[PDB]
Design a protein around this ligand. Structure first.
Ligand code: BEF
Ligand code: BEF
Ligand SMILES: [Mg+2]
Ligand SMILES: [Mg+2]
Lengths: 117, 117
């Protein structure tokens, strides 16, 4: 079962690191902006989402994803590490909040545990 | 319906503080040891589990939980915060890994987002 995974982040380096790591779990699509992702009206099982994006914030895209597909697992991945930012992420409907720099092995495990559901 | 949350930790203060923060979500039952938790034949939607216990390791308990009631959401709550301990947690079947000291408001959000599933 090769699931559909999406990675949204304006940082080229994050898209490469995350995609090449989650690739073993299935098909991975990478987007540089919220618009690139939104214009790709494909349904994904998991979405690794940056918070500080050039157009739409990660909180808004997360809410939009939940509005459309509540079953979607949304993992916010961001440099924002303060408690206030973590609370805002979950408030937006995020299923997880991971800070950068991150451990790719840990991100893999987090995604895997959701797919098993 | 009634959501049920178990809290297993040898630290009395963790049981009191967590239980008081989570009571708003549903019924919360506390346990000072793994043995006491394991001998309770009831089901829980979420189990907040300590790793360093007097009798068992939270990893061991987490494994048996998944081998008996895999539908249960298990959140490890421990002072162990290094990557290896985090990975061992997920390898043991954990659904989340929170480190002490923690923000009770964030743990609440983490518990709630599982209960909404
Ligand atoms: F720029 Be993202 F919020 F890491
Ligand atoms: F003793 Be627990 F692992 F914080
Ligand atoms: Mg960014
Ligand atoms: Mg302990």
């Amino acid at each position: 079962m090769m699931w559909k995974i999406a990675v949204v982040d304006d940082d080229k380096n994050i898209l490469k690191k995350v995609s090449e790591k989650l690739q073993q779990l299935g098909r991975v699509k990478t987007f540089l902006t919220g618009e690139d992702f939104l214009n790709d009206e494909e349904a994904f099982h998991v979405v690794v989402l940056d918070v500080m994006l050039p157009d739409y914030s990660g909180y808004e895209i997360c809410r939009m994803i939940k509005e459309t597909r509540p079953e979607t697992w949304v993992i916010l991945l961001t440099l924002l590490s303060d408690d206030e930012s973590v609370l805002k992420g979950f408030e937006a409907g995020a299923d997880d909040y991971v800070t950068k720099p991150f451990n790719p092995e840990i991100l893999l495990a987090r995604v895997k545990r959701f797919l098993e559901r």
